[PDB]
Write a protein that binds this ligand. Structure first.
Ligand SMILES: Cc1cc2nc3c(=O)[nH]c(=O)nc-3n(C[C@H](O)[C@H](O)[C@H](O)COP(=O)(O)O)c2cc1C
Length: 359
């Protein structure tokens, strides 16, 4: 099976092509992770996936999505990850982390606590920042503060510090969160970026925050460990061919700047869109980016059906298959997939204290 073939990227070898993508847990306190995350992540690693990417972890307090988001904006925050990293490694999975800044979509409630911007008089809330003072709208009506050049320098440095911290905590894989309408994505999109300085207007200017952040992170992130990013390559906003073309150009510049793999997603930059949700619906777009930027890719949404994951790999649409919600439902999804695909000794996807009994 293609799904259970190993994958080598730089010095890191994944035992199979199953990636667990970043999934916010909303269980941290002032950015500090705790035994929620420890057990969640170690349990997933033991389930058999080759790569486990820790949830969006804020590079700065105001870059959290919610009051429950993880952070890595101090060395104490980073140190909290060390035992979890060590547990993921003990289980034979590769520990990754997504470092993030939520931009104008920050200061929101947890998804089961309203999922909306925090009310003005709620002591938990904070001012958001963005390339331009324009609200997302809908359930995220707060108008962000327009970033100064010093803010841009500071946030880039926060990404650098976060990457340094992730390195020193023992992560073997990093993902820059430039997708899903958060700060990076919003610098790229003309919907959200109305700047007239070096960081807006033209394609080069809109790309600049993302490329400069990648280059700055590259200085401190080891060359022998995969350097990746998530990026929304279209919005389903009636501008898809032009947006895709630009996104693919940016992917080429990412590759030239040392990016090893791109997690291809949707932008979610604005609410007024028409996304054609369906099983593996991003497969063909991921394939186009892979082909036209000549860059390894992953993607997500509905690949928890093992045969569909297998088909996407065999069609060379993807290099890794990201499987999210199916792993919340069943942390041992990789074992289920091995069984479904008829892999020999499927139960040994799991560690011996499980595998022996399930043969
Ligand atoms: C609980 C939850 C939290 C998520 N948090 C993030 C995250 O931290 N960063 C990210 O880029 N995507 C996040 N996503 C998107 C997932 O990585 C993934 O793309 C999405 O769930 C689709 O894959 P699936 O159909 O296999 O669940 C999250 C989704 C879920 C379900």
């Amino acid at each position: 099976s293609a799904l259970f073939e190993p994958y080598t990227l730089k010095d890191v070898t994944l035992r199979n092509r199953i990636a667990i993508p970043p999934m916010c847990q909303y269980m941290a306190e002032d950015g500090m992770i705790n035994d929620w995350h420890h057990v969640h992540l170690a349990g997933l690693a033991r389930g058999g996936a080759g790569l486990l990417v820790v949830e969006a972890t804020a590079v700065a307090p105001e870059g959290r999505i919610t009051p429950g988001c993880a952070g890595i904006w101090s060395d104490a925050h980073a140190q909290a990850f060390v035992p979890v990293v060590q547990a993921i490694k003990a289980a034979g999975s590769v520990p990754g982390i997504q470092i993030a800044h939520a931009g104008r979509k920050a200061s929101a409630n947890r998804p089961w606590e309203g999922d909306d911007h925090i009310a003005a008089d709620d002591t938990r809330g904070w001012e958001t920042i963005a390339p331009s003072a324009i609200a997302f709208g809908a359930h995220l009506p707060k108008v962000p503060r327009e970033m100064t050049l010093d803010d841009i320098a500071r946030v880039k440095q926060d990404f650098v510090d976060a990457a340094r911290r992730a390195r020193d905590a023992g992560f073997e894989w990093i993902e820059l969160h430039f997708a899903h309408g958060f700060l990076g994505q919003s610098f790229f999109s003309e919907h959200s970026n109305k700047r007239t300085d070096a960081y807006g207007g033209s394609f080069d200017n809109r790309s600049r925050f993302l490329l400069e952040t990648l280059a700055a992170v590259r200085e401190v992130w080891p060359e022998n460990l995969p350097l990746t990013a998530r990026f929304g390559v279209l919005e389903y906003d009636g501008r898809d061919e032009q947006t895709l073309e630009e996104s693919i150009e940016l992917a080429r510049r990412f590759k030239a700047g040392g990016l090893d793999l791109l997690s291809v997603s949707v932008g979610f930059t604005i609410p007024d869109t028409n996304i054609p949700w369906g099983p593996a619906f991003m497969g063909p777009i991921a394939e186009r980016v892979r082909r036209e930027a000549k860059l390894p890719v992953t993607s997500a949404w509905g690949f928890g059906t093992p045969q569909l994951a297998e088909a996407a790999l065999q069609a060379n649409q993807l290099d890794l298959v990201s499987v999210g919600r199916a792993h919340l439902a069943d942390p041992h999804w990789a074992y289920f997939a091995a069984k479904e695909l008829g892999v020999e000794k499927a139960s040994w996807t799991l560690p011996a204290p499980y595998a022996h009994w399930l043969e």
